[PDB]
Every structure is written in C-alpha cells, then in structure tokens.
Amino acid sequence: IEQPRWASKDSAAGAASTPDEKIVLEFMDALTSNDAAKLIEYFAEDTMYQNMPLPPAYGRDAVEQTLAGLFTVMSIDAVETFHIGSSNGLVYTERVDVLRALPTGKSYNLSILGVFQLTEGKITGWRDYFDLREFEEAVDLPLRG
Amino acid sequence: SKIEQPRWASKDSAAGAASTPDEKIVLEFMDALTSNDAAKLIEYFAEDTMYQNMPLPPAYGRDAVEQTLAGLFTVMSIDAVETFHIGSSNGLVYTERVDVLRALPTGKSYNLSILGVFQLTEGKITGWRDYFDLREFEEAVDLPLRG
Numbered sequence: 001i002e003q004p005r006w007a008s009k010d011s012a013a014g015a016a017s018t019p020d021e022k023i024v025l026e027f028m029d030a031l032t033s034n035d036a037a038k039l040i041e042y043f044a045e046d047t048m049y050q051n052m053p054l055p056p057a058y059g060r061d062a063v064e065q066t067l068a069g070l071f072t073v074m075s076i077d078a079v080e081t082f083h084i085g086s087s088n089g090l091v092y093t094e095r096v097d098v099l100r101a102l103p104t105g106k107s108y109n110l111s112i113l114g115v116f117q118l119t120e121g122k123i124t125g126w127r128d129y130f131d132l133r134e135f136e137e138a139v140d141l142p143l144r145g
Numbered sequence: 146s147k148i149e150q151p152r153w154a155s156k157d158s159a160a161g162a163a164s165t166p167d168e169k170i171v172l173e174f175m176d177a178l179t180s181n182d183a184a185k186l187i188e189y190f191a192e193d194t195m196y197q198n199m200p201l202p203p204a205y206g207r208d209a210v211e212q213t214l215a216g217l218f219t220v221m222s223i224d225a226v227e228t229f230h231i232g233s234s235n236g237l238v239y240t241e242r243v244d245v246l247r248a249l250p251t252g253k254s255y256n257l258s259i260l261g262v263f264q265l266t267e268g269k270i271t272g273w274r275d276y277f278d279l280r281e282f283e284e285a286v287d288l289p290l291r292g
C-alpha cells in the first residue's frame with residue numbers, strides 16, 4: 001500500500017477520536033478475517049450493507065450472506081485507513097483495501113471512501129464507494145461484468 | 146431528474162445540514178456545480194490544490210483542475226446535486242450525495258451516487274476527491290468517458 005500524495009501525514013490522521021470511530025477501526029482490522037460470521041456481530045438487526053456499484057443488502061441475514069459470498073471469491077489481504085472522521089452518527093473512512101481474487105490469484109489495491117452509521121455501537125448502515133470496473137479488469141474477475 | 150430519498154438516509158437533521166463554516170462552503174460549492182461553469186467554480190479553489198474523480202487520473206494545481214472541469218462541462222451537465230449527509234473531522238469534509246448528470250451528446254441522464262471528501266484551507270479548496278462507479282454512468286448515458 002503506497003501512501004497517496006494527498007494523504008495526511010499527521011500523527012492523528014486515520015486515528016479514532018470518538019467511540020464510533022474506534023468501533024469502525026476495530027471493524028476494519030476485522031475485515032482481514034474474511035469471516036462473515038465474525039463480521040456480522042458488528043451489525044444491528046435493522047441494518048444494511050452496500051458496495052455502491054452493486055445492489056444493497058437489507059437486514060442482517062442478507063448482509064451476512066452477501067459477505068459470505070464475497071469471501072468465497074476474494075480475500076481482503078490488508079486495509080489501510082488514511083483518513084477517518086465523523087459527525088451526527090456517521091463515520092467516514094478514506095482507505096485502500098488490498099483484494100485478492102481467489103479464482104485467478106491476482107490482487108488489486110482498491111481506493112475506497114466508505115460511510116458507516118452506528119446506533120448504540122452497532123452498524124445500521126455501511127456503504128463503500130469505489131469503481132468496480134478497474135478492480136474487475138485488474139484481477140480478471142467480472143464481479144458484475 | 147427526480148432524486149429519491151434513500152431508505153438509508155440518517156434521521157439526524159444535523160447529519161443533512163452544514164454544521165461548521167467549512168461545511169457551509171462545501172454546500173455552497175455543491176449548489177454552484179449546476180452552473181456548469183469552470184471559470185466560476187475555480188474561484189472556490191486555492192492555487193495549490195488537487196481534484197480527482199477517483200476512477201480517473203488526478204489533476205494537480207488550480208490550472209489542471211480548471212482544465213479538467215472545463216472538459217467535463219463540455220460533455221455533461223450537472224442538472225442537480227442532492228447531499229444527504231455531510232460531516233467533518235481533521236480538516237476534511239465528507240459529503241454523501243447524488244449528482245444528476247446529463248450527457249450532452251446523447252440527451253440521456255443518470256443519477257450518480259457519490260461519496261466525496263474535501264480539504265479546505267482558509268475557506269479555499271485544497272483537495273477534492275469524489276468516489277463512485279464510472280461504468281454504470283457510462284452505460285446509462287452512452288458516453289464512454291473512460292471506456
């Protein structure tokens with residue numbers, strides 16, 4: 001993971017400054033588990049998850065099944081969060097996820113900006129924004145196609 | 146070019162309104178985007194600045210930024226911007242929105258979901274990065290911007 005020119009070099013960049021930000025960075029560390037059953041414990045029952053290029057999942061079961069599917073085709077090898085911030089119940093993370101496509105063995109560093117809504121320390125929404133095509137082309141996996 | 150309020154919209158009012166001076170300028174800037182006017186819009190930027198639509202290469206410096214905006218407004222109109230969520234920490238403002246984009250060659254429109262980040266220094270933009278999926282827009286409006 002190379003540090004972007006535009007990324008803060010400040011010691012507190014990417015560091016949690018509130019309880020919700022702390023939970024979100026714990027969740028980022030947990031992504032490299034590639035384990036949907038572990039991850040789903042961060043979510044509220046009334047919840048949703050969406051990789052924005054693709055349809056959303058609503059409710060905890062749909063979220064879990066979506067993560068389990070994703071982890072059947074790819075591994076999150078590494079996550080680095082350059083920037084984190086929050087206001088009014090929403091946490092934002094500017095990061096890179098290093099993804100490896102299991103069918104092809106090829107990896108790509110995916111640039112993501114994501115938003116997390118937490119209610120009493122549980123995730124009520126998680127939406128990640130990124131370009132899907134560039135990932136698909138890098139790793140020869142037509143996730144949507 | 147109606148924008149639908151998402152099922153996932155925050156029910157906290159402060160989440161949808163500018164709560165700091167920097168957030169207020171960002172929302173003024175979002176209002177201005179419908180001008181389709183790169184010369185007007187560039188006044189929001191510092192001389193030392195950068196802009197990137199994340200599917201595409203970054204522009205560094207105010208002139209490169211202006212030239213990029215001018216090119217974009219040659220091929221598309223931003224017909225509307227709605228910002229559902231705005232917040233900030235550590236000198237960065239984040240906006241979750243939909244921009245309604247219309248391709249000038251084809252007359253076709255698309256509602257593009259975007260999450261963007263802004264860095265402001267003394268009220269001027271020093272960085273702006275918008276994250277979104279480019280392919281869905283290109284296919285919707287028949288404009289292979291990247292291809």
Ligand SMILES: CCCC(CCC)C(N)=O
Nearest residue numbers: 051067070076097099128
């Ligand atoms: C389960 C993780 C999904 C990926 C992006 C999918 C293309 C990510 N957030 O790194």
Ligand SMILES: CCCC(CCC)C(N)=O
Nearest residue numbers: 198214217218223244275
């Ligand atoms: C000039 C504005 C660029 C567009 C997206 C380009 C594909 C936007 N921010 O709505």
